[PDB]
């Protein structure tokens with residue numbers, strides 16, 4: 001078993017990481033680090049620094065804290081000789097992820113930038129069906145109530161928190177996986193409430209290298225049922241991904257999919273990467289978001305109320 | 307020699323590119339493309355597609371148009387089997403540059419993303435002196451008066467349009483990669499790009515690298531990079547033309563940024579290599595992504 005530590009025991013750590021780790025036989029949950037939480041049955045620390053100082057035989061760390069502290073924690077873990085798994089986004093900047101990848105490669109360690117939505121069951125079936133066909137247009141709708149997915153959370157509204165791109169980048173992680181050709185941003189509009197620093201809604205107009213238009217609408221102002229949809233119009237009809245990747249229809253016919261197991265799949269991949277002595281750092285979804293911030297118009301809207 | 311075409315004959319093509327090409331023996335200027343300008347002594351076209359269709363023996367092209375039109379030109383040139391040299395910045399977005407580098411690598415073609423300020427006289431001496439030494443801190447001060455439209459449009463970079471030149475020097479002289487830790491963009495309420503900006507970086511050894519860019523009226527114009535080491539301060543001034551080390555001024559040669567660029571482009575084509583350093587643009591992108599934004603009075 002690979003000995004594993006988890007950093008930042010918050011919403012996604014309780015909802016997804018700890019259950020997936022517990023059911024993954026390749027890992028032994030050995031330690032956890034959190035300022036305001038502890039995990040029963042394992043050794044607990046207030047911060048990653050104290051965990052690394054004490055857990056010299058630990059093999060790997062998985063980071064579930066906000067992305068603004070991701071670089072500092074991942075660098076420390078890599079410098080201590082641990083393989084590192086990163087929640088999405090892999091960093092607040094592209095430069096820090098490049099530095100981490102070079103460092104992990106400069107230490108022979110596994111670095112894994114995870115995109116949990118890429119492990120949704122519809123993703124690889126969609127990629128396989130689309131690799132052969134003539135794509136005409138792509139439509140993305142990724143809208144959910146922020147208060148239901150990040151209740152009480154403030155880092156989403158601070159610089160490096162991405163705002164609506166925090167879930168929106170999941171859609172881009174799927175699109176960049178299922179489309180055969182690279183995307184380039186052509187225009188973007190970011191809608192930023194008067195009281196925050198990140199967008200609550202955004203529109204993206206991209207094209208792949210063949211000129212296929214990729215239109216995306218992200219919104220955190222929404223009712224209680226998510227709209228997490230990607231529609232690829234082809235010459236053979238429409239491929240429609242819905243429910244964040246849990247549902248797939250091709251030319252109007254539903255497609256049978258296995259059960260959702262995104263985070264089990266992530267941890268299985270992390271273990272396999274370590275046993276292979278390989279890394280997996282795809283920053284293309286974050287690079288497109290960076291282009292959106294660099295090139296995109298910014299429009300003020302009314303206060304969110306944080 | 308290498309047959310060469312130039313696209314976008316503006317003032318910098320007239321002042322810098324064409325004289326440098328004329329004096330570079332490795333190239334023969336064969337054709338130029340420009341919508342509103344013709345170049346004496348060579349064949350002339352109004353767009354790159356026409357040039358490419360006609361100049362079938364052409365080996366390479368140098369693109370001097372702004373980045374908003376350069377990506378489509380660079381694609382067509384690489385697809386036509388030509389080596390490509392790009393003015394700075396190499397793209398309007400990082401995705402554009404990634405596409406070109408993949409395209410060039412797949413056809414075995416030379417792609418050269420130039421940073422003309424990296425060829426200023428002080429840059430390579432500063433890099434040699436700093437390579438071995440214990441650096442403590444770096445400070446960049448870029449200030450000027452903007453009063454002396456694309457710059458205020460979404461994607462126009464704002465103060466980073468010239469400020470990225472200082473970032474290309476910083477990233478060349480320092481021996482380790484920079485990570486942006488905090489940024490602040492000051493945006494006039496009637497524009498979409500920053501008039502002033504502060505960057506807070508740290509290199510991979512933790513060395514703080516601070517940069518301030520200001521386009522507003524204030525104190526006297528300045529362009530300075532100061533790198534404090536255990537052996538004293540290294541100071542670059544005058545956009546890279548002037549160098550001081552531990553208080554001692556250093557003798558530098560005349561400015562030949564664009565002759566240097568074209569000599570390197572020729573050398574890249576000879577060795578079959580590319581040179582696509584996107585890090586100065588990536589740092590600017592990180593500032594737009596990670597930066598805190600502050601509104602100021604209309605411009």
Ligand SMILES: NC(=O)c1ccc[n+]([C@@H]2O[C@H](COP(=O)([O-])OP(=O)(O)OC[C@H]3O[C@@H](n4cnc5c(N)ncnc54)[C@H](OP(=O)(O)O)[C@@H]3O)[C@@H](O)[C@H]2O)c1
Nearest residue numbers: 008009010011012034035036037064065066067069087088
């Ligand atoms: N919310 C979701 O549904 C979801 C789903 C998939 C992926 N994710 C990703 O997972 C990451 C965290 O998401 P989340 O919803 O779990 O947010 P979160 O609960 O608010 O943050 C997780 C924990 O990180 C710690 N934290 C906050 N600031 C910190 C700081 N400076 N330094 C160290 N620890 C700090 C906190 O634990 P302590 O106070 O105890 O130290 C926090 O409880 C994000 O990158 C997010 O994008 C979220």
